[PDB]
Paper text:
The binding of α-methyl mannose to CRD4 is revealed by four independent copies of this complex observed in three different crystal forms: two copies of the CRD in form αMeMan/1 and one copy of the CRD in αMeMan/2 and αMeMan/3. Each structure shows the same orientation of the bound sugar. Binding of mannose residues to CRD4 results primarily from interaction of the equatorial 3- and 4-OH groups with a conserved principal Ca2+ common to almost all sugar-binding C-type CRDs. As in other C-type CRDs, the main determinants of monosaccharide binding to CRD4 are a conserved principal Ca2+ and four of the five amino acid residues that surround it. The presence of glutamic acid and asparagine residues at positions 725 and 727 in CRD4 determines specificity for mannose, GlcNAc, and other sugars with equatorial 3- and 4-OH groups. In addition to the Ca2+ ligands, the side chain of Tyr729 makes van der Waals contacts with the bound sugar. The position of the aromatic ring of Tyr729 is established in part by interactions with the side chain of Gln730. The protrusion of the tyrosine and adjacent glutamine residue creates a barrier adjacent to the sugar residue. The importance of the interaction of the sugar with Tyr729 was demonstrated by changing this residue to alanine, which caused a fivefold loss in affinity for α-methyl mannose. Mutagenesis demonstrated that these changes in the spectrum were caused by the ring current effect from the side chain of Tyr729. These results are consistent with the orientation of mannose in the primary binding site seen in the αMe-Man crystals, which places C5 and C6 above the tyrosine ring.
The human mannose receptor expressed on macrophages and hepatic endothelial cells scavenges released lysosomal enzymes, glycopeptide fragments of collagen, and pathogenic microorganisms and thus reduces damage following tissue injury.
Author numbering: 640 to 761
The structure:
Amino acid sequence: LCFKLYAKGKHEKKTWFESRDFCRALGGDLASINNKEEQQTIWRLITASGSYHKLFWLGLTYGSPSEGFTWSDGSPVSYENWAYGEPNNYQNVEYCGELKGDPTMSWNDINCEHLNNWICQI
Ligand SMILES: CO[C@H]1O[C@H](CO)[C@@H](O)[C@H](O)[C@@H]1O
Ligand SMILES: [Ca+2]
């Protein structure tokens, strides 16, 4: 799959659901990061665009209480890169996952209604 970054204007950021709908409208989905190679590919896209110090939606969304986090594309949640202390369901309202687009490429759970940049796979 081909990853593409979407880091548009300050008033063009989207909720997790809006971002998923955007990627699905293209025939793809929000990006799943399934191994270190895919993580590197996305980091290099960040460096190439100069889109530094931004937060991006990934396809991380909570499933049932039993399952915990899932990928919207159905990929197994095997590789994980949560920041230390995450996921933490801070204030009990965090059911989607974002990428911190810095060299750590770490993940954080955050409120799904937050307006973020996003990454599609197509
Ligand atoms: C203050 O809340 C923010 O920072 C903490 C980590 O400090 C995250 O867990 C949380 O989802 C928010 O991004
Ligand atoms: Ca969190």
